[PDB]
Swiss-Prot record, chain A:
Disulfide cysteine pairs (residue numbers): none
Protein role: Conjugation of reduced glutathione to a wide number of exogenous and endogenous hydrophobic electrophiles.
Gene Ontology MF terms in the entry: glutathione transferase activity
Ranges for domain GST C-terminal: 71-189
Assigned EC number: 2.5.1.18
Entry keyword set: Transferase
Annotated Gene3D superfamilies: 1.20.1050.130
Protein's recorded name: Glutathione S-transferase class-mu 26 kDa isozyme
GO biological process, one term: glutathione metabolic process
One Pfam assignment: GST_N
Binding locations of substrate: Y97
Signal sequence segment: none
Species in which this protein is naturally found: Schistosoma japonicum (Blood fluke)
From Swiss-Prot, chain B:
Family listed: Belongs to the GST superfamily. Mu family.
Gene Ontology MF, one: glutathione transferase activity
Upper lineage: Eukaryota, Metazoa, Spiralia, Lophotrochozoa, Platyhelminthes
The organism's place on the tree of life at top rank: Eukaryota
Gene source species: Schistosoma japonicum
Domain GST C-terminal residues, every copy: 68-186
Record has Nucleus as a keyword: no
Entries under Gene3D superfamilies matching the protein: 1.20.1050.130
Residues the record lists as binding substrate: Y94
Keywords: Transferase
Official protein name in the record: Glutathione S-transferase class-mu 26 kDa isozyme
PANTHER family in UniProt: GLUTATHIONE S-TRANSFERASE (PTHR11571), GLUTATHIONE TRANSFERASE (PTHR11571:SF222)
UniProt cross-references to SUPFAM superfamilies, sorted A to Z: GST C-terminal domain-like, Thioredoxin-like
Amino acid sequence: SPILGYWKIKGLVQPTRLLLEYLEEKYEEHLYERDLEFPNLPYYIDGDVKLTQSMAIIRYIADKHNMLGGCPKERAEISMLEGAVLDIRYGVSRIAYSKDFETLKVDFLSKLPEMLKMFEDRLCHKTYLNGDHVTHPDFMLYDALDVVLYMDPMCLDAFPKLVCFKKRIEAIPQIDKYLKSSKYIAWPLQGWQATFGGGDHP
Amino acid sequence: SPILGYWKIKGLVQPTRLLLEYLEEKYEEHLYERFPNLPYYIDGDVKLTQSMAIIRYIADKHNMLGGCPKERAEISMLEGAVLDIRYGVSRIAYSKDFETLKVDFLSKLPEMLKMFEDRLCHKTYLNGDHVTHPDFMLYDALDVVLYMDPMCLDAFPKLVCFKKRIEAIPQIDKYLKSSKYIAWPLQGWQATFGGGDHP
């Protein structure tokens, strides 16, 4: 059975866990708690491959299920959505370990509406980000939305399509079951030492 | 002709430029001096943003991303590992605290480079006998960290060899000596590191 190793946090691997549950893949986790030889996190091991880099890991899983895109144009479209979600999610992580977080968050939250609106407009004519069918950037976006809502519970008040998308992802039977399961890591969002999304509880 | 739009800097687009030159693709640039999301790439029906989507698209058109999920993952892994270096520079380059943040980065750098050094002991390029897009990403990353610290490759003779091997590819050698080459800046002009009009 494939092994996914990471900290016992949401962090970089949360969209990968959602994708795996969506696909009903069987996998074990190595969960590293607060306290090959270090090692390098996250990693993903099945028979064939040994991977590091969270984006290589999620892309591989998507790739094994033919979800990366059927032609160069489609695959670039998916890569583009990926990069656009990462600007949000990395935007959070970039400031979440600062003593100055309270200041830096002002800048971040000022730029967030424009970042969100691309996804909003995209969602006005598509059910999921790439259309009728779920793709891996959908779970990346879900994770980014979950994280920013802890930063600003109001940040989606002006985005009803994104509000709807978040509920839609939550209603996928595999996902709804996973979020209610004992497998679900609710918190922390970042490493425990973080000023935002760290600590033991919300 | 495809159009590549970006600031007139090296920045996020330099490896893409090296890939297009490697492949001898005819392309036009829109070079912004001194409003569109940058970079953009426009060929016939595709209009792309996000620099990773662009370089991967160009690679994809030339069948260079990988033949199976395993090989594609390996290339994405290489990609992500180069970006840890390149973005690592970028994230401190604009800080008032650059000089102090530099110390931490240069202390973490040998650890990052060693992975590439080992991988290059028994392969000519990152993925073996043939060039892939992460080679040009690595080239750009090496060029950048050498301005930060001229001696940071002294412990890495296989990386020093690799950088010269890339420069000796005839397309690359020619492009580097051409009028199209943008030598400087490495970052936005306003950066503390790799900014300004000249080195």
